[PDB]
Amino acid sequence: IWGSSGKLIETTA
Incomplete structure (x- = not known):
């Protein structure tokens, strides 16, 4: 999870 969603x-x- 390193700043992008989706x-x-x-x-x-």
Whole structure:
């Protein structure tokens, strides 16, 4: 969770 909503799979960007 690294600042986006919708696609909840974000390690850095």
